[PDB]
Symmetry: C2
Subunit: 597 residues, 2 copies
């Protein structure tokens, strides 16, 4: 390592909400040196050095009077002298008040590596450990930022207003580096995807197309080949030193009156696998670093928000301060925490403004609605079940447990679970119900790339590789091409047509975004619900039986209010609502009606 190998964060901005900034400087005996600076607006508060001489922490106070510009930080000591030019940048017009992703938005999820290979010459990069292999389910397939940029029109054309790629941060692992969740450098886009400047261009080109960028961020852990592991800043930088202490995933322990400390500590401090070292956020140096890094990425790349991986696995108090600091900087931003639980109360604990039994406060605006996805997936897979949708209905009834239930992210699927189409039992009619549900519910809708052309996977066992297959048309010489429509089967085309039809339609429905919901108890696996304000009503009625069903419309008259008939958006045909509602086998109708008197 040189005298300054790492300066983190590499640059900052003038006029941030939180005036403070702790620089993590890394370099040969840099911690044996005094620091000084001469710049108007900036004051050097203090320096903190640790037993490891190769690190120095420098505390700056950047006042409101401080102007955009650069200055040298001079390090004296050890009979040596060092200069480092530190840059304070000017913020973009309306940076702090930026519009986060909301109920109006629709999210398209991609795995950058598995989406599109716009540049084959960055499939392998000299120095990087893992060699690219498209034939291996866990290998690097070659997808990159160039590829994603090339087809932003496909995404915007589908009707989506947000792009959430899985992490693009450097994952210099020997094995399974494609997934992005084992960071080895927090401030560098993996060169296999492109440069840092390429990531900014992704955000700006998407912005032109009328799309925001949502970064997948990991706070809880890193990769075993992170440059920290060969030169640990502090002995307590990662949890459980050198001996492998795996977590046993007891998530309720942080919100359980009967919880043992052993379970609680095991959950927040335990490693996922031997290759993912768990960060210690109770160390204030680690906490500050993570907060600053994520803010850095938002400001630098013009992100509309974040998805926070493995949310609850980070220190609860850290998460409190983390979500506070980030929402202090961007008060209208949105961040969606991944809390993998099909239980509503377990998820609800983490949302902004939730009154908890233990007095836990949070500023996390959004969470992944795993309960509602799981209930609907169960309802469609369960053949013999007489009234499977009851599970969806009852789960929705629990929304009072969330402080903001209509701000949660609902999804057709993701990279971590069975393909949407396969989860429906490879049934187009059921898949349609799932799609309509997703697009009409009082939630932020998220869609996984490939589900629009009915991609398949295994439904049981662990087979993460099968959920993450290459997007047809992403690679040069692809048989099937989902971008142009070449090589697709009639069913795949119709599925793509429908996703496009429905999502673009959803963009022009403020009644789906901000309006109210009235649902009815499912009866004989049939379900009827309404989106409504004074401007519009949307009746969604679905029949989850392979026999035709007729529902008396007298039951729904507090919503119908005399309306004689309504035009289905899907089929186009007018459906009779006067006396009885005739529903076709395994069918769904989206009926639009005038505003309620």
């Amino acid at each position: 390592p040189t005298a300054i190998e790492h300066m983190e964060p590499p640059f900052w901005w003038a006029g941030m909400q939180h005036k403070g900034l702790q620089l993590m400087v890394h370099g040969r005996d840099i911690g044996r040196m005094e620091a000084a600076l001469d710049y108007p607006g900036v004051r050097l508060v203090s320096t903190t050095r640790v037993p490891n001489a190769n690190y120095l922490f420098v505390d700056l106070e950047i006042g409101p009077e401080a102007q955009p510009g650069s200055f040298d930080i001079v390090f004296k000591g050890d009979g040596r002298s060092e200069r480092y030019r530190y840059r304070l940048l000017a913020r973009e017009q309306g940076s702090a008040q930026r519009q986060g992703f909301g109920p109006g938005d629709a999210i398209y999820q991609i795995m950058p590596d598995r989406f599109a290979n716009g540049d084959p010459s960055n499939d392998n990069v000299a120095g990087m450990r893992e060699q690219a292999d498209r034939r291996h389910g866990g290998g690097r397939h070659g997808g990159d930022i160039r590829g994603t940029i090339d087809h932003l029109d496909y995404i915007a054309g589908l009707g989506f207003t947000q792009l959430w790629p899985t992490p693009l941060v450097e994952n210099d692992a020997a094995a399974y580096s494609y997934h992005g969740y084992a960071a080895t450098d927090h401030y560098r886009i993996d060169p296999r995807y492109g440069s840092n400047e390429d990531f900014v261009r992704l955000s700006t080109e998407a912005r032109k197309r009328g799309m925001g960028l949502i970064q997948d961020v990991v706070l809880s852990h890193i990769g075993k080949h992170h440059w920290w592991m060969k030169d640990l800043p502090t002995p307590d930088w990662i949890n459980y030193g050198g001996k492998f202490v795996p977590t046993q995933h007891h998530r309720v322990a942080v919100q359980d009156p009967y919880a043992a400390q052993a379970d609680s500590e095991n959950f927040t401090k335990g490693w996922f696998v031997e290759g993912m070292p768990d960060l210690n956020q109770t160390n204030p140096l680690v906490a500050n670093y993570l907060i600053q890094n994520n803010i850095w990425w938002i400001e630098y790349a013009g992100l509309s928000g974040l998805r926070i991986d493995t949310y609850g696995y980070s220190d609860g108090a850290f998460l409190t301060e983390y979500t506070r600091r980030l929402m202090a900087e961007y008060p209208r931003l949105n961040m969606v925490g991944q809390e993998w639980s099909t239980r509503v109360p377990v998820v609800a604990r983490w949302q902004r403004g939730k009154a908890n039994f233990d007095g836990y406060t949070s500023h996390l605006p959004s969470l992944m609605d795993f309960p509602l996805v799981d209930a609907m997936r169960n309802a469609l897979s369960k053949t013999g079940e007489e009234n499977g949708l009851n599970e969806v209905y009852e789960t929705l009834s629990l929304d009072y447990l969330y402080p903001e239930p209509q701000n949660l992210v609902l999804f057709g699927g993701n990279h971590d679970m069975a393909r949407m189409f396969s989860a429906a039992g490879e049934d187009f009619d059921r898949w349609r119900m799932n799609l309509v549900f997703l697009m009409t519910m009082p939630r932020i809708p998220q869609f996984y790339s490939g589900d629009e052309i009915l991609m398949t996977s295994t439904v049981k066992g662990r087979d993460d590789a099968s959920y993450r297959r290459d997007f047809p048309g992403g690679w040069a010489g692809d048989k099937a091409n989902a971008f142009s429509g070449a090589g697709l089967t009639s069913q795949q085309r119709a599925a793509q047509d429908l996703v496009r039809k429905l999502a673009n339609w959803r963009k022009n429905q403020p009644v789906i975004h901000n309006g109210r919901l009235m649902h009815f108890g499912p009866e004989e696996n049939t379900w009827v619900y309404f989106r409504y304000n004074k401007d519009k009503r949307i009746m969604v009625a679905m029949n989850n039986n392979d026999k035709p069903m007729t529902l008396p419309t007298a039951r729904f008259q507090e919503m119908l209010k005399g309306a004689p008939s309504g035009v289905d958006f899907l089929s186009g045909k007018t459906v009779g609502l006067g006396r009885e509602l005739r529903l076709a086998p395994k069918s769904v109708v989206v009926i639009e009606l005038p505003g309620l008197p």
Copy 2:
């Protein structure tokens, strides 16, 4: 009908908390008459008459100065005169402050008709519609109060301190009258069971044995052959006049932000079946009647509490006032509402002191813990599941949702679900885990009669008849006799021995009653939890695998705190707790340890 066919309630008491009393008088043109009385302490507030001339409602105010004694109520009008002697009774010493059933208690549930036939001569009673048939699963088998009294020693000897029989109120139906849930006379014990005086004697003889009496009460509905149905007091006395409007059981509609009025009304006003007319508690006359009737039974029979059938199906506001009035009269009483939901939030809504989103208040101290029973039953039935107990653990973690979670009633089973032993897959070792769980959890334990000798039933479909088979030894000439132990198989005896061993032991464990609980996340379908105060610790460890398991005791050291070994209460053998815990295949240990420093 005579000039006064019914005077309800038939008598009252001096010195009640609520001073008011509305008499429902029934008789030939009784409603065409003025009422008057001359008694010191009692004032006639007003009379209310309805379009049906055969009924009069008389409002009395019984002041604190009023003495025990009788007086004539004189009815003038129609050119007629009538006398009725009304009795005000003296209350028992400490009647209002009576001790309800609590965590210390243990409940034995019987179906009076299916328990013991102490008197064959009341199997049929002249006048009553349904003839007794012991051979028919839905027939009257002949069980009675005499039979229950005869074997109160068996029940107290088992270790139980409470007796909850299903309703004994007159059910004069043509079909399925044995179950008791279709009342035809609210103020009369069904003559097939005995007289009203016989029911009091049941309570007093049990009290001598150190047992309380818990009455199963139905508030929501009656039987189609209730004497009301042939002479309805008001047109709105029952819901939905003459046309059959069945309920579709959408219980969440009374606690759902997205609920339609149609679902909410359907739940509270819909009939169960064509033969069970739904009472309208929004009629103040019905509300008053039900409240007074249940209070009457408590005071009259010296009940330690109630189990409220089909709880949520009654009007929410009525239930508020109902639970208020009853708890005003008996502040230390306990009442356990049946809210059939495996979901914690749905059940929790009804408990006393629960802060609800809609501002719903309740005074119901207890509810049936269907979530925790269902989670544990799932955990034992699920063979292939790697870690099935996780469901029990996670459900327990949700107790913060209840205002008083440790006051809920947990049960091995009941008359409405598959036999406890059959639910365990006819596995004695699993049944044992279920039993220990029931007896050691921070709950009020309830046990279903027959489960102590491993009675069997079908596990799927509807077969209520199979859950309610005759108790062996209850009838003269029974092959098997569970009271004396004659004809029982080795397994049945050992099961009975264990229930007796454990329940009597539970009586002397205040640490199980009032103490704290610390559980640990189940790992590989093994589970470890602790009951603890400063006096005692109870380690319960169970292994739900047919292979032996070893658990490092270092994990549980915040509870163990150095303890080198402990004596299992079940086997008697000392189990090593120093380094590792050796658990036998499908085994459970109950280890008692000194108080925590």
